[PDB]
C-alpha cells in the first residue's frame, strides 16, 4: 500500500 494514516 501507499502511505496513509487513519
Amino acid at each position: 500500500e501507499f502511505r496513509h494514516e487513519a
Epitope: 500500500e1 501507499f2 502511505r3 496513509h4
Partner: antibody, heavy 123, light 113 residues
Framework: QVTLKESGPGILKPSQTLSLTCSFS??????????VGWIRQPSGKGLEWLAH???????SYNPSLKSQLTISKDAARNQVFLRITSVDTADTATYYC???????????????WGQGTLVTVSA | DVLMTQTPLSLPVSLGDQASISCRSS???????????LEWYLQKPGQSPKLLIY???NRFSGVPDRFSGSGSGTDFTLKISRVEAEDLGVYYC?????????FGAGTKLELKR
C-alpha cells in the same frame, strides 16, 4: 501562502540524466505527515505518477521507472529533487511538483500543484 | 497496476445539460485503513490539474455544488448537474490507495453541435 516551483533544463538528449528541482514555501517538509511528489504528463497525454518522498525520508516509486528514478530532498532549503537516468524521447513531458500528506489534517490529496516545467528529450 | 477506465473518453454536452462520467477500477480502492482514496481532477487547456473531489464524494474547498461524487469498491461516478462554460476540460479519476498511484486516461468534456 502555499506555492510550488519546478525548474528543469528544458532540453536534453537521450542517455543523459534529468535533474529537476522543486522549491516550495508555505509549509515545511520537516512537519510530521508532510510529503512532496512528482507527476508528469507527456504532450497531449495522460497523467503519470512518478514518485513521492516523505518528511521522514521514506520513499515511494513507480515500479516501471524505479530503476531510473531517484527522489531526494533538502528540508532546510525547502527543496525536493528528482533524477531520471537514461532518458529518451518517451520522457518528453511536462513535469509537476505536488504536495501530498498521509494525515487528514495536513491534506491527504493532490490539492497543490506547480505551474510545471517542460522537458523535451531530443537528439 | 490498478486501472482506471473512464467512460466515455469524449463527452459532448450543451451548457446547462447534466453530465456523468463513470470510473471503474480493476481492483478495490478501499485502503486497509478504512478509506477509499478516489479523487477527481480537472485540467483546463494549458493549465495544471486542480482537485475537485476527494475520498469519493468530498468536494474540495471552492468547488461549486453542481459537482458531486458517488460510488464504492471499484465503481465510481462524477456528476455535473448543470455544465457551465468554465467546466469544459479534461477530467481524470485517480486512486491513491495502491502503489503505483494511477489516473484514468481522461474524459474530455466538449461542446455539442
Amino acid at each position: 501562502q502555499v506555492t510550488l516551483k519546478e525548474s528543469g533544463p528544458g532540453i536534453l538528449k537521450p542517455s543523459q540524466t534529468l535533474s529537476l528541482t522543486c522549491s516550495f514555501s508555505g509549509f515545511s517538509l520537516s512537519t510530521s505527515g508532510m510529503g512532496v511528489g512528482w507527476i508528469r504528463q507527456p504532450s497531449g497525454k495522460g497523467l503519470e505518477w512518478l514518485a513521492h518522498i516523505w518528511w521522514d525520508d521514506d520513499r515511494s516509486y513507480n515500479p516501471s521507472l524505479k530503476s531510473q528514478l531517484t527522489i531526494s530532498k533538502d528540508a532546510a532549503r525547502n527543496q525536493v529533487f528528482l533524477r531520471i537516468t537514461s532518458v529518451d524521447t518517451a520522457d518528453t513531458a511536462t513535469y509537476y511538483c505536488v504536495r501530498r500528506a498521509h494525515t487528514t489534517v495536513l491534506g491527504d490529496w493532490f490539492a497543490y500543484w506547480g505551474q510545471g516545467t517542460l522537458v523535451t528529450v531530443s537528439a | 497496476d490498478v486501472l482506471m477506465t473512464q467512460t466515455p473518453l469524449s463527452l459532448p454536452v450543451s451548457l446547462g445539460d447534466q453530465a456523468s462520467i463513470s470510473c471503474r477500477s480493476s481492483q478495490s480502492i478501499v485502503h486497509s485503513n478504512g478509506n477509499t482514496y478516489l479523487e477527481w481532477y480537472l485540467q483546463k487547456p494549458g493549465q495544471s490539474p486542480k482537485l475537485l473531489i476527494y475520498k469519493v464524494s468530498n468536494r474540495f474547498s471552492g468547488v461549486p455544488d453542481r459537482f458531486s461524487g458517488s460510488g464504492s469498491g471499484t465503481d465510481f461516478t462524477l456528476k455535473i448537474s448543470r455544465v457551465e462554460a468554465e467546466d469544459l476540460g479534461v477530467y481524470y479519476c485517480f486512486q491513491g490507495s495502491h502503489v503505483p498511484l494511477t489516473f484514468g486516461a481522461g474524459t474530455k468534456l466538449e461542446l455539442k453541435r
